[PDB]
């Protein structure tokens, strides 16, 4: 279970990290801390607690 929840967290960040180069007019101040905080909110609690 825990090895299959890290895999969802990486595919979510492999595709979110291109949102700034694709849409520069919406994300002018979105530093890469901002898509780190967003995936950790939508992730299960017992995976970040590990």
């Amino acid at each position: 279970v825990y090895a299959s929840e890290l895999s969802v967290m990486k595919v979510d960040m492999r595709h979110l990290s291109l949102m700034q180069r694709r849409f520069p007019d919406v994300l002018i101040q979105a530093r890469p801390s901002h898509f780190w905080k967003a995936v950790l909110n939508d992730s299960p609690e017992a995976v970040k607690a590990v």
Binding site: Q29, R31, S33, H34, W36, K37, L40
Partner: protein, 45 residues
């Protein structure tokens, strides 16, 4: 709000010990200067 005061990893999560401000240290700095001089002059001739 600002992108440097945002914490993701819980390494910088500590207990708040005390808080000092702007106009609380400036009066404090003027006290500890004159307290040193009024103590030195009161011990020697």
């Amino acid at each position: 709000q600002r992108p440097e005061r945002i914490k993701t990893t819980p390494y910088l999560e500590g207990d708040v010990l005390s808080s000092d401000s702007g106009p609380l240290l400036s009066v404090f700095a003027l006290q500890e200067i004159m307290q040193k001089v009024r103590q030195v002059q009161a011990d020697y001739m």
